[PDB]
Paper text:
Human papillomaviruses are non-enveloped, circular dsDNA containing viruses with capsids comprised of 360 copies of the major capsid protein, L1, and an uncertain number of the minor structural protein, L217,18. Five copies of L1 intertwine to form each of the 72 capsomers that make up the T = 7d icosahedron. L1 takes the form of the ubiquitous jellyroll of anti-parallel beta strands (BIDG and CHEF), which are connected by flexible loops that extend outward from the surface of the capsomer and constitute the majority of the L1 hypervariable regions. The asymmetric unit is comprised of six L1s, five of which make up a single hexavalent capsomer and one L1 that contributes to a pentavalent capsomer.
Quasiviruses were used throughout the work described here. In this study we used a subparticle refinement approach that allowed us to overcome the previous resolution barriers in HPV structural studies. The high resolution capsomer maps were recombined into an icosahedral capsid with 3.1 Å resolution overall (ISECC_recombine), a dramatic improvement over the original 4.5 Å map. The recombined map allowed the full asymmetric unit of HPV to be unambiguously built for the first time. The improved resolution of our map when compared to the previous 4.3 Å structure (Guan et al.) allowed us to correct the 36 residues making up the C-terminal arm extensions (402–439). The pentavalent and hexavalent L1 capsomers share a common core architecture but have different connecting arm structures (residues 402–439). The connecting arm extends from the base of the donor capsomer, looping into the neighboring capsomer to make a disulfide bond between Cys428 of the connecting arm and Cys175 of the neighboring capsomer, and then returns to the donor above the initial extension. The second, larger putative L2 density, approximately six amino acids, was found flanking an L1 loop region that extended from Ser306 to Ile327.
Residue numbers in the entry:
A (entry chain A): 12 to 485
B (entry chain F): 52 to 151
C (entry chain F): 203 to 483
D (entry chain B): 16 to 481
E (entry chain E): 354 to 403
The structure:
């Protein structure tokens, strides 16, 4: 069986995916999201979310859905043979539109674990009392990125580890660290200058970092792992532009878990008898946001992806991870309890916070053909089984049949069930993750020059639509 | 069937004597993938389906079902009446079923 | 059902003249005279019908006589017959024996030529299949026991019910047809039905203004404005005020005809057998 | 890799011109029409239940055509070819006269006759059950295939985890598919439902179907299965009209909505039962409308299986409600008396059925190439296991050490010898298994269906007298 | 509550017709013999034609 032997190495998609000269334009309309920047406003009695968390420090992982090209109808009839070939989309252009004005938005904690300002201290103050927390706010480090792949991105953060079963651990001991790899989901917080760490687990204090990140994981994209994966599916190309400087040098109150060795200093006297806390922490500050340093609102043409998957959108899917903290202005809107008053009163006005993001994604796809011979079939199967399976290529009808029984009123009583509880067939394993599912099944258009990215692509390629009107040019 | 204090339908009404008007929905042929697609120019042509054949399957066994009213307005059987009946009092209704 | 094609809710305040099946309903008969005389022949281009009935029992009606018998139609009696019995007769209908031979269904119907001018063209990507079948109306009577302990039958122990189950399965063979829209054909189609052209194309520099709609995420929450169904969209089906049994065949099309009973029936009718791949037979 | 799109048997199955005739001698069956008789202490069946409304699902067993010794086997090569039987003709002979038998219940849940009521029904009491009989719906059918048929009926399902079920609630329905077996009751005009579960009354339908499951053949699913094995031929006739219109008795489980009628007063204050049921009746039976006693030539099957009897098997399902005459017997307890006494005679019921099947089988050769082998293996694996070809012998030899004195107490226990034969996948089902292994004959001229086939094909017999 | 004297009963019947014809034009060369024959058949025919 199988005259050829399995290919032992990963080959580039330029070897079995044949590219055609048919291009399509797809685009979302305009994606808005209003919410609270620091926490979700839940009900006092129920835990239904009334105003969700929509901040500028969040990952925005869009899960683009493309139409199945094995069920389309291009200006052809039988250009592809459905018994030997199968079609697939290849992303050849992207543009991540952004809507709101540039700006920086601060956050903070009403009770932040800050002892004193160790930047320029006047003298030696007494030791910490009880509940030495202040209300401190800070603007985070500035970040922009754009990951594009056909599989979800992959983050990294420091979590808590399980200490070896040889040490005797006492309460209050330092939790061991371990670098955890997790898929980035829409709504994960991007690191802010305090590190890529688990803040719920590693800081039981709940009072060291600001409100938006005090009980959440801050992840960083694992480029080392994402570019070194064999098939290169989760990263076609990426951009990143981070910047930060330390604004204020602070301290941290609490029991010194690990004391300064008596070798590194000379024992003091008087007011300097007990060492001030040497758990320093800086306040990040992402500096000036400018318009010339923007990653977005520009077209990005994929000439050659980083890995071996050269932009092929396997499984009719595509992921656009987007972070930018350069449009993160929280709008401060208030309301009046009574309009009858003619003087001012701090107890008369109830203040609120909001944040509104605006996106608009446009793409340019190119139809591709994969003539599924024997060895190409074995390769596509070993790379990803659900690829070769979710288009039913090498399958006969099973001897049983697929005659469903559908009831016309499936909510009513006295028909046995809703009849579809178990997710047995075609359930993508991303059941568990939450993305900004974008449905581009009704948005493809072969009229390229009618859309802004379409005519940008036409310019870059050097083409133009054939004239509908006769002479009169220029 | 509906629970009296609410107004939600628990069991709908499904008799043999109703119209079954099906509203089929066909795929848009101008957005389809055929063996070949460039057979019709999208700028001066359009596609459409035509019904060439149809078959309405039916599953249950043959049979006649009967219905009726628990209080049906009948006075007397006038097919063959032995003699003159009495006079109509109040509420002379009867329970009578019939195959349609 | 044998009681006329009338509106029983408004024409009979008695609420007791016809069975519970059509006590407050409207009994409608297909208007063949009007559906056939339609200019374009869209509403129907193929139909079958069987209907049989005989008068089983002959009855009377109780109530105040609405129109008296004219006194020159009968000779006045005296005694018991001094007051007239009600002459408002109504027959109890009866559809006779059902048979497997007289069946209209479970058979393929090849629409070779339609009745009107629309020769089977499903305009607007739409098809309507109206079906009445009073030959499978068996109502299954089923009961439940409120007490499984009792070993003596008691009418107050068993609760009786009535049920009915329909089973359908529709199969079609569609044919792709192409229409070259010149000026003449375009104006003729715009005269026939403007929605046809308004649904494809051919005249729309779509707006002069943008048509980009900005959709919100988490649109159930109370942090935004009013994002729920308030302004309408091109959602306007002209048949939205009507309730049909919807059937979505958008994902059920298949060019492998010989894989389905009606597909290979159509092949066998047209000859047109599939090409044998397996060597020699 | 291999293939899609199930293909007709006319592509890999090559026909020959060798025809054989096989036929059962005569199949008789006597019994009781309503219920099976059994001893009080035991449960051995003394007189089975042989009704005219049961399915007769014959499982025919054909001889393996690969172990036929043909004189010149040079027409097929057992190294690369295998043989199979194709059913070309069939006749389902019926023996008894035309007649209609009736069934009933001594305690049937019937309140009154609501066809034409002379006055509003009086009070309802306890146990208004009557003794009512009825002749059922008329039915004939004959399904033939290489797999058992598939039936359909409505059954009780489990309700959701949403509604609190009170005692006496209506059981939810569900269309359940099953294999039709020999002795399953055909639908009789009361529907295709599970009367054991859906009616705890045990008094709503007559005696022979009050505990049974009336099934209907599922043609929608049998013709739509991919390979077309369950049936490749079927005929059916069925007629029924409503003879009488009745009423039910019991606590009304669903009240009539108050906006359908106008409340009564006095005699008509309590609503009479609105649960109706008609008694079916299959009218005149005729010899002109007979499906059976006729030869059927299976030229073009309905599916892709053009009459190939895979696995040397054939299932003939038959319903004949046209010869359901139940004969009423009687025995005298004492043969001395000179005066009639009802206590002197023991009344009985008996029903006798009579069948006679005949088939004309055509021999066909399947040349097993690689793709034909893969296709047949995907379609059915027990085919390529029944025919010695696949499963090439993976392992090698291994010593078993064969202890000499196995029943001694100086060694361990040598016991193994474990397996009982495990072959039959259709062992759970009950069919009227017909064995045609010693009944094949190449002399079609000598059998009635054989000479009918010869006459229909032309092909007169070779002359022997000058 | 239902009362017989509360409801008046009537009977009605409605017919529905639709007549369609296909007519063909015919010419009659009115010679002497044809005119005499039509005058013997029906003279109002020869009258309504003036």
């Amino acid at each position: 069986y199988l005259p050829p032997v399995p290919v032992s190495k990963v080959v580039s998609t330029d070897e079995y995916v044949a590219r055609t000269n048919i291009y399509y334009h797809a685009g979302t309309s305009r994606l808005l999201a209003v919410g609270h920047p620091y926490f979700p406003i839940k009900k006092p009695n129920n835990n239904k979310i009334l105003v969700p968390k929509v901040s500028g420090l969040q990952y925005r992982v869009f899960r683009i859905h493309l139409p199945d090209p094995n069920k389309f109808g291009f200006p052809d009839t039988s250009f592809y043979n459905p018994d030997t070939q199968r079609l697939v989309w290849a992303c050849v252009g992207v543009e991540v539109g952004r809507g709101q004005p540039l700006g920086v938005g601060i956050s903070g904690h009403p009770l932040l674990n800050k002892l004193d300002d160790t930047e320029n201290a006047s003298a030696y103050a007494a030791n910490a009392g009880v509940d030495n927390r202040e209300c401190i706010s800070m603007d985070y480090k500035q970040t922009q990125l754009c990951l594009i792949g056909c599989k979800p991105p992959i983050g990294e953060h420091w979590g808590k580890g399980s200490p070896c079963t040889n040490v005797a651990v006492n309460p209050g001991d330092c939790p061991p660290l371990e670098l955890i790899n997790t898929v980035i989901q829409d709504g994960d917080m991007v690191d802010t200058g305090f590190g890529a760490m688990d803040f719920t687990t590693l800081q039981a204090n709940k009072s060291e970092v600001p409100l938006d990140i005090c009980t959440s994981i801050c992840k960083y994209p694992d480029y080392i792992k994402m570019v070194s994966e064999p098939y290169g599916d989760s990263l076609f190309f990426y951009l990143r532009r981070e910047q930060m400087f330390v604004r204020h040098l602070f301290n941290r109150a609490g029991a010194v878990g690990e004391n300064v060795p008596d070798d590194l200093y000379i024992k003091g006297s008087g007011s300097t008898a007990n060492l001030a806390s040497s758990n320093y922490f800086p306040t990040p500050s992402g500096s000036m946001v400018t318009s010339d340093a923007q990653i977005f609102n520009k077209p990005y043409w994929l000439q050659r992806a980083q890995g071996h998957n050269n932009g092929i959108c396997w499984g009719n899917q595509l992921f656009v991870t987007v972070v930018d903290t350069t449009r993160s202005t929280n709008m401060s809107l208030c309301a009046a309890i009574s309009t009858s008053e003619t003087t001012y009163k701090n107890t008369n006005f109830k203040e609120y916070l909001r944040h509104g993001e605006e996106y608009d994604l446009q793409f340019i796809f190119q139809l591709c053909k994969i003539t599924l011979t024997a060895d190409v079939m074995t390769y596509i199967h070993s790379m990803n089984s659900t690829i070769l399976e979710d288009w039913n290529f090498g399958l006969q009808p099973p001897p049983g049949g697929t005659l469903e029984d559908t009831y016309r009123f499936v909510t009513s009583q006295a028909i046995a069930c809703q009849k579809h509880t178990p997710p047995a067939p075609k359930e993508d394993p991303l059941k568990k993750y939450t993305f900004w599912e974008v449905n581009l099944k009704e948005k493809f258009s072969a009229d390229l020059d009618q859309f802004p990215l379409g005519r940008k692509f036409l310019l870059q390629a050097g083409l133009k639509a054939k004239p509908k009107f006769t002479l009169g040019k220029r």
